[PDB]
Amino acid sequence: NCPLDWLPMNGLCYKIFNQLKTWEDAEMFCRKYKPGCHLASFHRYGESLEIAEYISDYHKGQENVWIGLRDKKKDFSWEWTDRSCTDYLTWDKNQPDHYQNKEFCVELVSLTGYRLWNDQVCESKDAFLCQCKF
Amino acid sequence: NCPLDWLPMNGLCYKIFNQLKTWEDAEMFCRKYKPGCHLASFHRYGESLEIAEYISDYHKGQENVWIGLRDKKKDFSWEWTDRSCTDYLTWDKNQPDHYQNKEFCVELVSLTGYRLWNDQVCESKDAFLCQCKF
Amino acid sequence: NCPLDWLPMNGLCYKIFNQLKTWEDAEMFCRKYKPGCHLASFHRYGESLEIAEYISDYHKGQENVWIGLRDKKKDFSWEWTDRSCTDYLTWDKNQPDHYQNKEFCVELVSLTGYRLWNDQVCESKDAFLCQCKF
Amino acid sequence: NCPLDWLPMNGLCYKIFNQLKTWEDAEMFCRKYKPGCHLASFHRYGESLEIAEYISDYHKGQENVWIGLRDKKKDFSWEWTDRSCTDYLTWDKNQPDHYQNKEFCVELVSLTGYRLWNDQVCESKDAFLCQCKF
Amino acid sequence: NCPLDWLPMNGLCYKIFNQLKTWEDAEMFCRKYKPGCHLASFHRYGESLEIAEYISDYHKGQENVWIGLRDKKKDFSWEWTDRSCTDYLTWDKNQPDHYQNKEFCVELVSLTGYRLWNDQVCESKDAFLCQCKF
Amino acid sequence: NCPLDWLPMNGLCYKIFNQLKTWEDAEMFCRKYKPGCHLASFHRYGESLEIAEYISDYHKGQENVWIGLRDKKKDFSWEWTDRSCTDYLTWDKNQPDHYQNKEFCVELVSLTGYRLWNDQVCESKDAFLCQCKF
Amino acid sequence: NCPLDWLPMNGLCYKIFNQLKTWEDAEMFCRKYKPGCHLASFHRYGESLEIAEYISDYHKGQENVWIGLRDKKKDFSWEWTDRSCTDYLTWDKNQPDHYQNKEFCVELVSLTGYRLWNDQVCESKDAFLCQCKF
Amino acid sequence: NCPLDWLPMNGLCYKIFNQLKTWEDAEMFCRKYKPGCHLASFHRYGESLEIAEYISDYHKGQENVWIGLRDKKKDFSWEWTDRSCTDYLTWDKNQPDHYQNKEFCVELVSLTGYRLWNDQVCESKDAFLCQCKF
Amino acid sequence: NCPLDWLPMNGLCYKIFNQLKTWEDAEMFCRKYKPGCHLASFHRYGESLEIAEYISDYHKGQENVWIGLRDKKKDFSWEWTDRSCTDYLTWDKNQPDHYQNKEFCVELVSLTGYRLWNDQVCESKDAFLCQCKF
Amino acid sequence: NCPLDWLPMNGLCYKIFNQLKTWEDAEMFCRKYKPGCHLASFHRYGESLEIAEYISDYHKGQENVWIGLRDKKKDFSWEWTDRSCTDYLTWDKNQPDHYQNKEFCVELVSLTGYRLWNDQVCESKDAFLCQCKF
Numbered sequence A, B, C, D, E, F, G, H, I, J: 001n002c003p004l005d006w007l008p009m010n011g012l013c014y015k016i017f018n019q020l021k022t023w024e025d026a027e028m029f030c031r032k033y034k035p036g037c038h039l040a041s042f043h044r045y046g047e048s049l050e051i052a053e054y055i056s057d058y059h060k061g062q063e064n065v066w067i068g069l070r071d072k073k074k075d076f077s078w079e080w081t082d083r084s085c086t087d088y089l090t091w092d093k094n095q096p097d098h099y100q101n102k103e104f105c106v107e108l109v110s111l112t113g114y115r116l117w118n119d120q121v122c123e124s125k126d127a128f129l130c131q132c133k134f
């Protein structure tokens, strides 16, 4: 059960925000939105499609979207900000790759209908997917 | 738990919309009604009965009802829009048939009291059953 | 959770309506109150007692109360209108009997503190117990 | 989950009403407050403590509080009006005593911080603790 | 479910209040915020991390945070005010110490990122973390 | 799971023994069959039907069956020997009656198909129904 | 969990016996096999296929097989001997029909690979499907 | 589920060993009987009664029985060796008394039917009650 | 819970059999190993990993492993023999292909460490993974 | 339920093996003990304590104990061999540190009562905790 403008999915609620922010700020906005929120985390193929479809339908934009997967210790060591060990990974073709050794934040590729992930420059200004418990 | 004009059923909420739309526009209407909605999917006889009765009682019309099953690959591969599994099919007599090879979207047949399905011209305009998670 | 004027019980909500109706009108009235409602069905001893005391305190009357149990094929094959599973029967003394071969609808016997059931003439006017999913 | 002015506790909702009433009236006030309410029943030391602390903080008064325990048959066979089992008792010192054969209704004693029980004349006016299923 | 501005966590709802109060007044303020609230109790590693992060982001201050742990008997016998079991302790380095034999109330230590506890003078003014059941 | 020759029922295991014993000896025999056994207690309609049918088929006799219900205080205050709650009673017609003020033990009545109970002289010899946790 | 020669399926265990018996005797054998057994009952399409496949694989014969569905009051009023109201029915083409007014016991049609049911002469000597709880 | 000579109770298995040992040895005997065993801890009146009755029937002797409660710090801070919470206490009359400052280990008193507890000299030889997770 | 030489995984038990058989004979061997068995079906990445590792560790060979997925209608309609749903596919590079239109049965590819699948000549002789419910 | 010489805990079974092995050999030893075993992983405070006391009573030694936590990519990206979810970490004081840049395997520090963890040289010989699904 969630607010009517959020996507209910397996116990949690999701929502894309169209305000562009770096990954760091996206996490902080979700965190400061309401207590118990973070950038979204995925844990099963089913959710990726559901979220992708939802974003495609409600994202008032065309820009990619930040999710809660960032490689803190720079070396393909990703963790979910919602503290739920990485047990799922639907990486896009030829991704990740730390392009120029300056990309450690996963984003949903808009070209892939948001069905494929991609390591990105955390400083990039994308839209983001918050996830909350209400 | 669902809104007062929706039908609570096995974790989901269902509602017939008397508005006539093509299958496509019906799915899209459900998807944009609120996040987490699709044309209803069915997975047990009990649901067909409940919904059939629901529709008979609440549908302000006599038209057939679109549901989320459509043969996207036009080769009898029926798939639910909510990505649920096709483990239940209650086809009406002689259906599906792909009449004039222009019928790939499923509807609830009015004459059957909305209990059996039939492939129909996706272009047809029927009422529809939305299914949502709240 | 139910509306404040309903009785929450084992997942469903119940309510006595003091309007006197025929079994059939009572059923249809419940069905049209909101999607997912029927004459109440029982499945355990505790519910009978619960309901019995409920009705006694809220029934602005003295009449019997219709419930969703009815012998559709007039042969002692009782079925609940909510299609719930018929696995509990708290018949009153010497019931059912299909008295005069014209009693096929079940009511809560007011003289048994609304705890025992009696097959009755479906056209009799009784108060009724609706049961809904909210 | 309960209304904001009610105390949620092990599935039920409790509330002290400061209005003074006889046991019988307190019971009927709860019963008619909303379907599924009774004078509260207690089932573990934890509940006595939570309730005792709740009443001390919210009770606007100093009177004892009626609870759903009563000796209907006057043989020290205490029963809860909510038909729950008498699987826990926390009588005050020297109670229950059926003082002068005129006390068969149980109240939480204000002098014990509302922790302990005392059989009281049912005709006494006490504040009361309702318990409801919402 | 919790009010939209609270932290939903394992069945309970939490919220930091930035008003500075003594431990005693923090408890009372929580208890009087609505029936069923107390200073928070902790029972798992996850709750400490979740709470610690929630406080880091929403605490409009830099002060320590009172919690429901206190040593009523002043002999290192810590009890939670919500009467839950003391089955989890995350003491800061060299704590508890009953410093100067005046510290009997527990607080989340700001310097530990609100992850570790310290027994403190109950008369000290800190922000506080309430925990309610709604 | 129960030993392959016992009746698995709602978490417990039941077995009728055809040896004729007094109520007291039936209890003791159950208690000494293995730790955790007692004369059976009943708590639902389904258990009465299931037990009644099980006894009709496996009872190598025609005698009545002792069960764990007894009136220790001899004042119609029936308690189960397994100390479970007396929340379900299925007394035969005109029972219990403390006949001749000597009947304080309960038995399943053969003539009722072992569905209904009767208080009986504890010194009477009946077959008995044990209930064990394995 | 079941014995290694039984088919575990949704909480219960199933097993075809090759001894031919009338429906009445099949029920009595299953009942007398171990306490808590009856002729099998089906409640979902999934089970029918699973049972059909299992029977096809382990049935040391070619004869049809009795299941726990019999029309006691002769008039298309079937009930499951395991007392679980009829909520599923996968009747074979042109079945039932009380052929000659002397057929009220459902059997699994061997020609249909045991995937289709059929009303039969309860006196017929078929193999049977027991179902137990262990 | 437990071995046949053990008492199943609320998830654990209990057993009285008639061998007389000091508290410490009893604890270590349980601990080494099999991984996950300790002297028993009690958490509700029901358990005291079940256990008391169990010991009276199976204990081959008349000696008191050690249980996992001990005052490690000798300040009346009783703790269970199985680290379960001390959320229930049923001391015998005039106990615990740290008689002569030499009693810090708890035993079930034989004179009370093994229902009540007494702090005893840890060096005393008692029978003991183990508790295991199988 | 499974036999000691089987791999417990999400309610089911799996085991590789080093015996070489055609896909068909592998399914049949599983089906006749004990009721309730089929060639394993997969529904999550976690299972592929667990089984892949299991096979690497326990498979006494170097051959590929048959699993229950087969395109029965030779038109890329993959179906699990255990009738589970095809909601997970981890095809190996360039697969499936229907090489020489004579490959319709799936196997776990050895060179991929038994993590990815490939359509193969059902007539091939591979080792196989049985899946059973015990 | 586990073998009598294992520790049942939260769905899994655990056992310390006093054979001193390298982290890698300990893992493989567990993997080959029976399908579904790995070096143990932890996820909650209670397990640490449970295991800690378990090992202390059964470890025929003094060495540290290997657990399934290891930093595969030598960059502080710790992962459990059972692929379970990495969401709990009870590191010892100043750990992890990758001392000399050669410690990438985790052990239960014997000096911390086997409660805290230490990243260690994978080639060190330690005792180990296996974890299995039975």
Ligand SMILES: OC[C@H]1O[C@@H](S[C@@H]2O[C@H](CO)[C@H](O)[C@H](O)[C@H]2O)[C@H](O)[C@@H](O)[C@H]1O
Pocket: C093, C095, C097, C098, C099, C103, C118, C119, C120
């Ligand atoms: O008419 C007064 C008596 O009614 C019966 S109950 C009544 O019984 C008839 C058959 O005799 C039909 O089943 C009805 O449906 C049923 O309501 C009571 O048992 C008696 O005590 C009188 O009250």
Ligand SMILES: OC[C@H]1O[C@@H](S[C@@H]2O[C@H](CO)[C@H](O)[C@H](O)[C@H]2O)[C@H](O)[C@@H](O)[C@H]1O
Pocket: J093, J095, J097, J098, J099, J103, J118, J119, J120
């Ligand atoms: O060597 C004795 C001290 O050991 C440390 S623990 C030890 O610390 C080193 C780095 O200093 C590495 O992390 C090792 O992996 C780790 O085991 C204790 O903290 C001290 O008390 C001494 O016991």
Ligand SMILES: OC[C@H]1O[C@@H](O)[C@H](O)[C@@H](O)[C@H]1O
Pocket: B095, B097, B098, B099, B103, B118, B119, B120, B121
């Ligand atoms: O006769 C063929 C046609 O039958 C109709 O009943 C149906 O609406 C069409 O979809 C088509 O199947």
Ligand SMILES: OC[C@H]1O[C@@H](O)[C@H](O)[C@@H](O)[C@H]1O
Pocket: D097, D099, D103, D118, D119, D120, D121
């Ligand atoms: O004198 C005995 C009296 O003691 C009082 O404390 C109590 O309220 C009365 O009910 C009565 O029992």
Ligand SMILES: OC[C@H]1O[C@@H](O)[C@H](O)[C@@H](O)[C@H]1O
Pocket: E095, E097, E098, E099, E103, E118, E119, E120, E121
């Ligand atoms: O030196 C001891 C003191 O240490 C401080 O850090 C703490 O705030 C005090 O509560 C007291 O424990």
Ligand SMILES: OC[C@H]1O[C@@H](O)[C@H](O)[C@@H](O)[C@H]1O
Pocket: F095, F097, F098, F099, F103, F118, F119, F120, F121
């Ligand atoms: O007449 C009263 C008697 O009725 C019998 O049927 C019963 O066995 C006795 O227990 C007693 O109740």
Ligand SMILES: OC[C@H]1O[C@@H](O)[C@H](O)[C@@H](O)[C@H]1O
Pocket: H097, H099, H103, H118, H119, H120, H121
């Ligand atoms: O004299 C006091 C004594 O009372 C006994 O009943 C008890 O076993 C002893 O532990 C001690 O307390």
Ligand SMILES: OC[C@H]1O[C@@H](O)[C@H](O)[C@@H](O)[C@H]1O
Pocket: I095, I097, I098, I099, I103, I118, I119, I120, I121
């Ligand atoms: O190149 C085509 C072939 O590739 C092989 O690796 C595979 O085993 C065959 O099934 C076929 O797909």
Ligand SMILES: [Ca+2]
Pocket: A095, A096, A097, A098, A099, A103, A118, A119, A120
């Ligand atoms: Ca990139």
Ligand SMILES: [Ca+2]
Pocket: B095, B096, B097, B098, B099, B103, B118, B119, B120
């Ligand atoms: Ca058609």
Ligand SMILES: [Ca+2]
Pocket: C095, C096, C097, C098, C099, C103, C118, C119, C120
């Ligand atoms: Ca009647």
Ligand SMILES: [Ca+2]
Pocket: D095, D096, D097, D098, D099, D103, D118, D119, D120
């Ligand atoms: Ca009194």
Ligand SMILES: [Ca+2]
Pocket: E095, E096, E097, E098, E099, E103, E118, E119, E120
């Ligand atoms: Ca301190």
Ligand SMILES: [Ca+2]
Pocket: F095, F096, F097, F098, F099, F103, F118, F119, F120
């Ligand atoms: Ca009697």
Ligand SMILES: [Ca+2]
Pocket: G095, G096, G097, G098, G099, G103, G118, G119, G120
């Ligand atoms: Ca026929």
Ligand SMILES: [Ca+2]
Pocket: H095, H096, H097, H098, H099, H103, H118, H119, H120
């Ligand atoms: Ca003592």
